[PDB]
Amino acid sequence: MGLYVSRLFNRLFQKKDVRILMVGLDAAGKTTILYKVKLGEVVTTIPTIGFNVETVEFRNISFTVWDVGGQDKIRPLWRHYYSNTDGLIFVVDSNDRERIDDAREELHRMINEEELKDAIILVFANKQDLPNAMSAAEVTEKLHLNTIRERNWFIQSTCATRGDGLYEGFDWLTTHLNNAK
Numbered sequence: 001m002g003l004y005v006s007r008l009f010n011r012l013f014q015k016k017d018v019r020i021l022m023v024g025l026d027a028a029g030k031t032t033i034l035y036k037v038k039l040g041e042v043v044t045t046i047p048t049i050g051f052n053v054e055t056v057e058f059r060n061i062s063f064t065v066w067d068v069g070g071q072d073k074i075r076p077l078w079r080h081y082y083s084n085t086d087g088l089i090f091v092v093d094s095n096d097r098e099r100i101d102d103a104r105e106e107l108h109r110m111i112n113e114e115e116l117k118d119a120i121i122l123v124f125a126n127k128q129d130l131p132n133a134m135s136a137a138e139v140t141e142k143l144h145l146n147t148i149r150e151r152n153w154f155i156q157s158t159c160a161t162r163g164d165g166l167y168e169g170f171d172w173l174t175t176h177l178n179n180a181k
């Protein structure tokens with residue numbers, strides 16, 4: 001698993017530094033995905049009391065992961081990670097309808113950051129395994145992804161716990177990060 005996903009990134013070996021942010025509300029499935037793709041050690045750090053960041057690095061690639069939609073007064077704290085971002089992965093809980101609108105706002109707010117203006121957008125509609133989970137289509141509507149313009153985005157159904165859709169999602173991401181600039 002980690003093997004085949006690791007290969008996908010060989011595509012970007014020429015790139016000096018591939019920066020990938022992976023965000024989403026808490027409990028969307030971010031941490032699960034990191035330990036599921038086993039691309040590298042999930043080094044955890046605590047920049048400031050209460051703010052938890054997970055970092056995975058391998059070769060010229062790095063992932064910086066943290067939860068959004070928490071105490072939206074800490075949002076400026078996240079800016080330290082926007083500069084030179086090549087790709088943005090937004091993980092969403094497809095089964096959580098109560099907070100899908102919060103996800104939407106965090107996402108649209110985040111992709112309109114001057115510094116994230118040219119980042120590829122990968123959306124993981126996670127927890128597709130759950131019975132009453134919104135289909136990728138309904139998550140696309142709730143996240144209002146069709147209102148995104150001039151941006152290269154893609155929504156991918158996944159079950160982080162089993163790994164389904166991860167390879168596909170990353171296959172798309174790395175393919176586009178490659179011919180970006």
Ligand SMILES: Nc1nc2c(ncn2[C@@H]2O[C@H](COP(=O)(O)OP(=O)(O)O)[C@@H](O)[C@H]2O)c(=O)[nH]1
Nearest residue numbers: 026027028029030031032126127158159160161
């Ligand atoms: N049913 C189901 N649960 C999942 C899936 N992905 C993650 N979870 C669970 O949802 C919770 C999210 O935790 P992670 O630690 O994954 O959360 P996050 O880092 O805050 O997004 C954990 O209880 C996971 O075991 C999935 O595809 N299906």
Ligand SMILES: [Mg+2]
Nearest residue numbers: 027030031067
């Ligand atoms: Mg987490």
